[PDB]
Structures are given as structure tokens and as C-alpha cells.
């Protein structure tokens, strides 16, 4: 196949921050009672609550898909902590979560901005460029998209389904054999460290909605 590179050195991808649980006074309510949710379930419920006043929030297909995925994450996480048992979408009340998110948004309007802009781009400096064939090359797509609910257009049957968080374990890094491997985060390991010179991608993984590939590729 056409050899795309002789040598390729890179620092991988930037993972979105880990989820931060909501403050104790912000909960999903089920039949009017506050539900103590494990963080993974809470995160997923929060995706719907943030979208509470959007068109998507009233689309029954969106509600169905979100709810089935929410119940699935709930099960994986061991269920609610205060024994409530969530069985029906209609008994769920996301209002306080929604109002809190709106409050969060509003508070941010008071930001500092450019400084953050600087501390970020300085950090991203290491991922925005790679060294290919000994030359500094630019990389587009060094950030993995954060989890959220898939918003499909029209009568998309999968609208409302959860796009899961992509972990290091799902990713394949492609680089020169001798090239130093960028440490995966915290206590994770990479899904694979490949050394294929016939492809120009730097990292690759699959997204869960359509089973298609995502890639970290070089700028045009």
C-alpha cells in the first residue's frame, strides 16, 4: 500500500475531564422523592435534563431511547443508593437538574476567559502537532468527543441514544516502532499500540451509535 510515513511521533489524544457529580441538593426526582444516583447514572440523567426544554425532550422516540440507555447504565452501576427503583420515564422529574444546569450556564456569563484560553492552548500545544518524518506537522482532531445523547434528525430511530464516553482502552494509537508511547491516563492502558506506515491516522476508535470509525488525522 502507499507508505504514508517513514517515522511518526505523537502524544495521542486529549480526553475530556472525568464526570463531576452534582451537588447534594440537586437530584432527579421519581414519584416526587429524591433519587440518590450513582455518578454514571447521574451523568446520563443529566444529559436529558440539560435538554429538557428542547424539541428533543418532547420527542417520544428520543425519550424512549434515552430511558432505555439510562436504565442500562443504571443497571451497570448497581442501581440507586436510596432504594427507589426507576421503572418508568413518566415518573421521572428532571426539573431541578435542568434549572441547575441553566443556573450554571448563567453564572458562567460572569467570567479570565482569555487566560483560560491561554492555559488551554498551551496544554493542547503537545497534541496539536506531531513529528512526522522529522518535521513538525499539524494534527486536527486530537480531542475525543465527550459523552452525550445522540440527536438525530427527523424520524431518526436512534435519536436519544447515549454516545458513551470513549476510554484509552477503546483507542488504537499508530506511531513509529521506536517512538515513545504517550502514557495513557490515570490508571488506564491503551487499547492497542500499532505501527502501520500504510495509513496516515494517528489514533482510531469506533463510536457506539453507528459502529463507524473515529480518527485523529493530520491537518490538510
Largest Cα–Cα separation, the chain: 63
Angstrom distance (rounded) from CA 207 to CA 145:
10
Q: Which of 61, 87, 111 is the last residue of a domain?
A: 111
Angstrom distance (rounded) from CA 51 to CA 202:
34
Angstrom distance (rounded) from CA 95 to CA 81:
20
Angstrom distance (rounded) from CA 97 to CA 77:
20
**Residue listed under C-alpha cell 475530556:** 16
Assess whether 24 and 105 both reside in one domain. Answer: yes
Assess whether 42 and 102 both reside in one domain. Answer: yes
Angstrom distance (rounded) from CA 152 to CA 211:
15
What resolution in Å is listed for this PDB structure? Answer: 1.9
Show Cβ contacts of residue 48 under 8 Å, excluding neighbours closer than 6 positions.
57, 66, 70, 94, 149
Pairing mode of beta strands 33-35, 28-30 = antiparallel
The number of distinct structural domains making up the chain is 2
Dihedral, 29, 33, 37, 43 alpha carbons, nearest 10: 10
Q: Walk across the sheet containing 172-174 and list its strands.
A: 8-9, 129-132, 135-140, 213-218, 203-206, 172-174, 192-194
Give exposure, 12-41, as e/b (b: 16+ Cβ within 10 Å).
bbbbeeeeeebeeebbbbbeeebbebbebb
Assess whether 98 and 71 both reside in one domain. Answer: yes
Assess whether 100 and 152 both reside in one domain. Answer: no
For 123, counting Cβ atoms within 10 Å of its Cβ (0-12 exposed, 13-18 middle, 19+ buried), the class is exposed
Angstrom distance (rounded) from CA 76 to CA 81:
13
Sign of CA dihedral 171, 177, 180, 186: positive
Amino acid at each position: 500500500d502507499t507508505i504514508k510515513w517513514v517515522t511518526l511521533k505523537h502524544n495521542g489524544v486529549i480526553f475530556p475531564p472525568p464526570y463531576q457529580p452534582l451537588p447534594s441538593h440537586i437530584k432527579l426526582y421519581y414519584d416526587g422523592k429524591p433519587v440518590d444516583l450513582p455518578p454514571q447514572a447521574e451523568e446520563v440523567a443529566g444529559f436529558f435534563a440539560a435538554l429538557l426544554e428542547s424539541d428533543h425532550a418532547k420527542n417520544p422516540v428520543f425519550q424512549k431511547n434515552f430511558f432505555n440507555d439510562f436504565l442500562q447504565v443504571l443497571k451497570e452501576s448497581g442501581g440507586p443508593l436510596n432504594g427507589i427503583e426507576i421503572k418508568e420515564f413518566s415518573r421521572c422529574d428532571f426539573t431541578k437538574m435542568f434549572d441547575y444546569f441553566q443556573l450554571q450556564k448563567e453564572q458562567k456569563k460572569q467570567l479570565e476567559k482569555k487566560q483560560i484560553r491561554l492555559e488551554r492552548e498551551k496544554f493542547e500545544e503537545d497534541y496539536k502537532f506531531c513529528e512526522l518524518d522529522g518535521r513538525r506537522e499539524q494534527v486536527g482532531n486530537f480531542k475525543v468527543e465527550p459523552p452525550d445523547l445522540f440527536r438525530g434528525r427527523g424520524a431518526h430511530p436512534k435519536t436519544g441514544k447515549l454516545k458513551r464516553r470513549v476510554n484509552p482502552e477503546d483507542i488504537v494509537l499508530n506511531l513509529s516502532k521506536d517512538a515513545p508511547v504517550p502514557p495513557a491516563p490515570e490508571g488506564h492502558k491503551w487499547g492497542e499500540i500499532r505501527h502501520d506506515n500504510t495509513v496516515q491516522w494517528l489514533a482510531m476508535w469506533r463510536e457506539n451509535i453507528f459502529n463507524s470509525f473515529k480518527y485523529v488525522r493530520l491537518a490538510a
